[PDB]
Point group: D5
Chain length 156, copies 10
Amino acid sequence: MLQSQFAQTPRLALADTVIDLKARKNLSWQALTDGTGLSLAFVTAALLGQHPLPKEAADIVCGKLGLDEDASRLLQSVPLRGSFPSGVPTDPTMYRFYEMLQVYGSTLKALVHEQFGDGIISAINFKLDIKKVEDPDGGSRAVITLDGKYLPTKPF
Amino acid sequence: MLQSQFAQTPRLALADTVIDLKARKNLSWQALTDGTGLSLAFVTAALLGQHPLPKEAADIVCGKLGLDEDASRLLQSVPLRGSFPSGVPTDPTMYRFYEMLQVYGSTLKALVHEQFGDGIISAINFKLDIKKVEDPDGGSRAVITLDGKYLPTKPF
Amino acid sequence: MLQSQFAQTPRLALADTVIDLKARKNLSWQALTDGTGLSLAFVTAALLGQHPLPKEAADIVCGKLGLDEDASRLLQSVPLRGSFPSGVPTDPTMYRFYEMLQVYGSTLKALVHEQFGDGIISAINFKLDIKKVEDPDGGSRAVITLDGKYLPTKPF
Amino acid sequence: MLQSQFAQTPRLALADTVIDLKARKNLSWQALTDGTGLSLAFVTAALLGQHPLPKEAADIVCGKLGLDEDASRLLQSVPLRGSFPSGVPTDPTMYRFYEMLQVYGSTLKALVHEQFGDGIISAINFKLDIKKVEDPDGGSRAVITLDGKYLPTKPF
Amino acid sequence: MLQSQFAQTPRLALADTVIDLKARKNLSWQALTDGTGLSLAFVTAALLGQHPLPKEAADIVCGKLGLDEDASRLLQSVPLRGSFPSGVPTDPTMYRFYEMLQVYGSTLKALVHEQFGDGIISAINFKLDIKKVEDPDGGSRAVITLDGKYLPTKPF
Amino acid sequence: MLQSQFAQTPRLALADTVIDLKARKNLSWQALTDGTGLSLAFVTAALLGQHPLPKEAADIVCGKLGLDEDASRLLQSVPLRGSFPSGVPTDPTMYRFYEMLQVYGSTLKALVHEQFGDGIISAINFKLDIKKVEDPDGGSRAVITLDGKYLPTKPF
Amino acid sequence: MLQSQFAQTPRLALADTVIDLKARKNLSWQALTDGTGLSLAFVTAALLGQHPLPKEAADIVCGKLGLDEDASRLLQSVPLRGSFPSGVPTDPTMYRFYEMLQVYGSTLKALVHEQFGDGIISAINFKLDIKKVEDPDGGSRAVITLDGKYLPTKPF
Amino acid sequence: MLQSQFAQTPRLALADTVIDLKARKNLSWQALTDGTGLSLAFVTAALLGQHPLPKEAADIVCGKLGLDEDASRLLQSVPLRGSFPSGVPTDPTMYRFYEMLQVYGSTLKALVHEQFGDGIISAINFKLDIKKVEDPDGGSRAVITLDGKYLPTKPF
Amino acid sequence: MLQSQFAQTPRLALADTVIDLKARKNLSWQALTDGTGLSLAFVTAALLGQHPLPKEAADIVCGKLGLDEDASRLLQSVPLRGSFPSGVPTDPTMYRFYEMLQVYGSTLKALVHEQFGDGIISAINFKLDIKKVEDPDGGSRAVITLDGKYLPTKPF
Amino acid sequence: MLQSQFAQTPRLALADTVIDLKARKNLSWQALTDGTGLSLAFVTAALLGQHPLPKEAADIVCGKLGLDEDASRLLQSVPLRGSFPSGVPTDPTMYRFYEMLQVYGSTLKALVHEQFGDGIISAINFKLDIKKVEDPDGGSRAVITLDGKYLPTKPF
Ligand SMILES: [Cl-]
Ligand SMILES: [Cl-]
Ligand SMILES: [Cl-]
Ligand SMILES: [Cl-]
Ligand SMILES: [Cl-]
Ligand SMILES: [Cl-]
Ligand SMILES: [Cl-]
Ligand SMILES: [Cl-]
Ligand SMILES: [Cl-]
């Protein structure tokens, strides 16, 4: 039976505990995802308070971190989502993604309506991934793929 | 001498004109991008006030819309960027991209630091692309690629 | 080719014109919906700047109001939506619906997750209806029906 | 003597305990409502801090959860209401209901004044219910009914 | 058909005109209320954009100010209400009433629930009046009466 | 020596204690006022953190609630006043008074200047009272009297 | 009959005209105050939209600037006061007075309650003066005197 | 070596202790300042978290309050200043000083530039004092003196 | 007599015309500074509304831009300063300077207090310059020098 | 594996400890920087929560303060950066740097586009330095150097 949260505090406190135990055991997010059968972006988001995990995955990650059954039960609950509820990010790393939306937000709207029609690209029927690729200039680039269902607005 | 704007008002008024003339001439954003040698998302963003265009591309787009030499010069100016300066978007289409950042923002930070290191993904050394694909369950999906250079923090 | 707006100013000015002409001609919202084949809530929202109308409906409503082809083209454009972008409403009539959300918002979330699962009730695959009913206590009641698709959040 | 709260902190803390105990005991919101004679939405809202319960109902739900007399006394107090006092929700499930109000808020006002008159649809003399129905595509829909008394504004 | 406003701008502009003409003709608010059969507080609020007037009263006030049929029709339309939509007042005269609410707001809630019960004192089924009385210490006092219907919150 | 607070936290914590003890003893606000010689609204506001009480009254109310000398000393200290410092109220009961000010705020200013002159109605040389009347339409009404000294603004 | 404003726009527009005409005639604020019989701070505040002037003073100031009777009548109206309604000042000169309040605001409250009692120092029964003094260490100092009536808070 | 704070929390907690011990010992702000050789406004501000005290004065006031050497070391640290960081004050006593700036802020700017020139009146090279004077019309007045150095803005 | 502005609108409108005329004549900011005898950063800031220019410099730059005597007089007026009064910048170029303050703001305070003492680094007795330097590792760097007088906070 | 923070709370609590221990041992920021091989501004920012330290440097600074291995591990984690996430600073020392951005922000943008081109000055590839210089007029000045890489916008 699915349980849900009405406030962020319990799952943010669990995320605090994950960050601490992960650092103490010198673990990576990839290591916590290994063996769950789920995607790196989904499992990491769940541990940071933004998704529930299915029971089997929750128990797997909880064993790796040394978390108990109470923690696993909480990880399986549907959270109250939002990773920056208290204002636009000040952190440069997070801010750049907001800046991408500032520069291209109106473009995304315009091109969605041209290429698809009236409606939205879903954030729920939706997958996200990030990959590192080499830049021909020698550096590296992050390629973030947003893959969302088009939901049309139809007259009724 | 490259020129720049100190306020959004002139380029937003020019964007207003573009929207109106594009509708009057029944044009697409793709048609305005055709012949510029630049990508759809970049030219559309420029027309909506978020990038300068080089002189050649500015003159081509202005020719298609019936805009004069003053408009083309304004289009070649460096703008004061930002497509939603007056609050989080209320428009559902733009809001969904903000929601993606709310759910995955902390995950993106965590995975950038794991896969790249301390630093940022650029929003200016940056490419944006939208593809429309078929949805297996019926309908269509948008696959949006954000491609940004990794810039490391420099200890000093 | 479908056209879209990047700012609210043009459609809000058209809505201003609609309000003025509707009053001068002593028309009702029901009369403006009559003959479109569309629902009262959808057509009224479109006229107030929150939806595009298809060409045939746009042409019919503009005929009743005495609006020209430029207005009809604008009415057919996809708007930048949001009926209160400048803060929580002060108007008592609109505020009561906001108050309903303040009192029951956490309940709606909890019961959606219990009866449907993780995910959302859609605001896009969505229909709205308002009915007037006579109250046994004397007077009347409004029965507002929100009818939205459940979109599940699935692990990936 | 009926008692009331002047701050949200105690009832939010009680709601915290309800969420935790219902998860620990594998109870549903419907299970807690059973036997109170009150509607699911009302009892759930009360437990989440937005209504008082009558003594009989409060003792019923507290008995199921293992909460003591101090908790039941607090549940019987009139709360300081508001389920999102610290900003527009970031949670997608809650946000969609806010978005419905952004798109249709001005329409609701217009149609209330046309069909009822000057005045408001009450959020106090008011009932809310949520029903799950099938969608033809094999999924499901939520039909949320808002049923409020019309209170007229009359000259004085 | 009763008409309504969706934006404040037309009625605020009409209020602007009223203020200017009132000053030019050396009129009082009492003089504009005289002959309408309505209360000073209601007619004054209507002229300042916060209520509609019935046709007869609207034509009378409009006659005293020299306003035409267009102004009178607008005065008869249901407004989008709110006399300070852009922040807490800075004006000392209005601010003091806000301060009374800051000092006594929690007291009013506490005493309403004790003397009436759970529910609200209505701002819609509501009358306001201001009286001037001589202060025994010299000077004068304003006695402002707020007279609102108690609307109970009952379980459903 | 009269003492004063620089932060709300201690008196808000004392108010928390008052609410809890009042509920445990099934007391009314009227019972706490009885025997102090002061008005219900003043004593209630003091206990909710918005006024100091004189020593005699502070000792009487503390005796009824079971509060010690430390609580009484704090009740005698001048508070940092303000019953909603963190935003416009979400609670329906408190909000209605704010709405009253939104609708009639500009009217109150206009009528004060007409009937008194330039200046303010005091929130300091000020008395507040709430009375219940059993209204012929069935139910009851609250009659709230705001009684404030007129303080004129004079050239200097 | 004393007239009053409900919006700042007319007096801000008059203030714009004053500033422009003052610059064209190379006048000082002191020259505009000369002959009115009123204080420099009061007349300057009036011209900047924050006080009404008496008829005789309004006429004298209007004659020196070349302003007409419409301007004088508006200058005699009671304004909607507030010189920074749109946020904390960014201007360094005004900001320093705000900073004085940030550093010493809690001290001013504490010392008012110690030296006077519970209550306020009036901003209405109030005089402001600024004086220039030479600094013994070279340069000059501004001595700004705030002179306000103590209004006590008394139990009722 | 001079120490400094980067967050307000420690000095606000110390100010909390000062307020409590001052009340327990029935001391005045004047009594705490007397014997330090410093001005009442400076020492009171320091104790409320807004200035560091020199070692000799810090130990003297700590001796009067019964505070230990840890507290004195904290009182000697340069604070992160600001007595209302969380919004415009709601407290009437503090608010009147803010209202004074709302009414006269633009006047102060205007007269500073006239009597001194471009630049600022300093809030750092600055002294404040408060003086109680008797009012001829019965009662008392506060005379608050702000005394700041003029720092000119010169072209460079 | 030195003149000053009380609102930003005139100088922002003048800045608008500067930007437009500078682009039409294809001028550089350096070209506008040449011949004034003043620094590039000061003259540019003046033209963008943030400083007054001396008469001779104002007349020189106005001659180069084709602005008339009215514009020069406005350029000689002391402005109401602030280049982003309407929120944190969205433009990436301006935002980075804000981001440096976000990252290093607490460090600047700490190191100012250690190296200088209690007090401030002045923004008024202050010079700014920006210089382009080659980066030893490739590309270019901007070196922005902030040169401000230390003003100590001393006890009084 | 590099670790990162998702919330500011742990590194802000460590900064609290650093400040306390630094004062207790009467240390300077320079003494904490000595031996790290890093610059004063970088190490100080790291200790205040704004940068990770390399292991060697983290261990050295922890040895000077009496901090354990948990503190050092935390200092090596990439922080969620931002030294004023809860509003514009009230602290005068910090505020002056914000004020320099208010006065010169548009100038910096303008001159970056003139001297470098379209793009930004980095806050990430960035060095900060403070120098104390004696003022000829008596006293001292801070010469603060901001040294950031120019990052060009890449059209695509
Ligand atoms: Cl969605
Ligand atoms: Cl949706
Ligand atoms: Cl209601
Ligand atoms: Cl109501
Ligand atoms: Cl008052
Ligand atoms: Cl006052
Ligand atoms: Cl200063
Ligand atoms: Cl300064
Ligand atoms: Cl950067």
